[PDB]
Design a protein around this ligand. Structure first.
Ligand SMILES: CC(=O)N[C@@H]1[C@@H](O)[C@@H](O)[C@@H](CO)O[C@@H]1O
Length: 355
């Protein structure tokens, strides 16, 4: 939006410096995010996507509960900057806006540069699972229904495919047929949750690497950010999604497929950190499904990218027409390698589970 509008938005919030600039920031696909520069402190300003999160009140109640609980344990988290009237967010001209303090002295990654970073990521999310277990499910109402219900996502995909709104299906038969042919695999976690063989836990639900901030000196995790999808789920949702994004040797939207590989060394690093925090709570069935949770969350994200492509890119932010097709192709390549390397990942998990 225009600067005049954005500076106007900023005036609603209890900022502690004169605003010098407001610039688009980051590579989130969901909310619209800006960096607020002032004559002193920095801020993150976000317009919340109400298409995706229609219940702003409940979303912000969840974020408030999580952050306040963290604060009350002396743990660094997202710091909501209230409106000048003391609200946690503002509705301004049909849009929903919030502000967080900018988290200083941090670095973040779209791509793992070495195993130590990814091990730290694993430790961070594993520990966060322990933290979240202090809530009961009723405290955190789901902000999006069926969020990691892969069979439900597959129904959405099949509908998008059948409608073929833009006639884009013709150019992506191999990708479409990949998702269709994997239909027998999608229900494994949901079935286990439904019959009680997989514990229902409170989870983060979007554990991609760029949602953690590492300290610029120590390299230790400083804060987990993007708290919008904290709700009941399976541990496997958080594990699988982390492996999806972070065990790849390439960016999520890497055009050159020959650069895209699933790294078992990176898998090992994350799992060491993750399981290292959760050894006392992880069940036999959860441990058994750790490798496949990689496949599943990658296929889920991929079919979502492709469905969006087939629907004309209504859900995810895109930079060019084919962007979601480029995204779905990396996810497919990753799953193909995860399948091929299955015995190796199983062995890695078993080795970590005993030690
Ligand atoms: C809320 C929401 O849809 N979040 C999605 C997440 O589920 C996954 O699709 C990710 C891929 O980079 O993009 C977003 O963060």
């Amino acid at each position: 939006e225009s600067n005049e509008v954005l500076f106007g938005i900023a005036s609603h919030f209890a900022l502690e410096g004169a605003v010098t600039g407001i610039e688009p920031y980051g590579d989130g696909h969901i909310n619209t995010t800006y960096l607020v520069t002032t004559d002193g402190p920095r801020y993150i300003l976000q317009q919340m996507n109400t298409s995706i999160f229609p219940d702003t009140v409940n979303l912000m109640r969840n974020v408030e509960l999580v952050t306040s609980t963290l604060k009350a344990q002396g743990k660094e988290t997202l710091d909501i900057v209230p409106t000048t009237s003391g609200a946690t967010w503002a509705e301004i001209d049909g849009g929903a806006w919030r502000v967080y303090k900018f988290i200083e002295h941090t670095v973040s990654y779209n791509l793992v540069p070495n195993p130590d970073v990814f091990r730290e990521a694993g430790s961070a999310f594993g520990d966060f699972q322990n933290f979240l277990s202090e809530f009961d499910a009723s405290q955190l109402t789901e902000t999006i229904a069926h969020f990691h219900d892969t069979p439900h996502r597959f129904e959405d995909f099949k509908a998008a495919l059948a409608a073929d709104k833009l006639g884009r299906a013709a150019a992506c038969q191999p990708e479409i047929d990949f998702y269709l042919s994997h239909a027998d695999q999608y229900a494994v976690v949901m079935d286990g949750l439904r019959d009680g063989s997989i514990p229902l836990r409170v989870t983060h639900n979007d554990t991609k690497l760029n949602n953690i901030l590492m300290d610029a000196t120590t390299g230790k995790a400083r804060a987990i950010i993007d708290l919008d999808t904290i709700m009941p789920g399976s541990m496997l949702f958080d594990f699988g999604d982390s492996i999806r994004f972070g065990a790849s040797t390439a960016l999520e939207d890497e055009k050159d497929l020959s650069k895209v590989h699933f790294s078992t060394e990176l898998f090992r690093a994350y799992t060491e950190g993750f399981v290292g925090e959760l050894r006392g709570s992880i069940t036999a069935r959860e441990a058994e499904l750790l490798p496949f949770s990689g496949n599943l969350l990658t296929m889920e994200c991929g079919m979502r990218f492709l469905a969006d492509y087939l629907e004309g890119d209504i859900y995810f932010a895109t930079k060019y027409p084919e962007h979601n097709l480029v995204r779905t192709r990396t996810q497919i390549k990753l799953v193909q390698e995860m399948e091929q390397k299955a015995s190796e990942t199983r062995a890695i998990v078993a080795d970590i589970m005993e030690a």
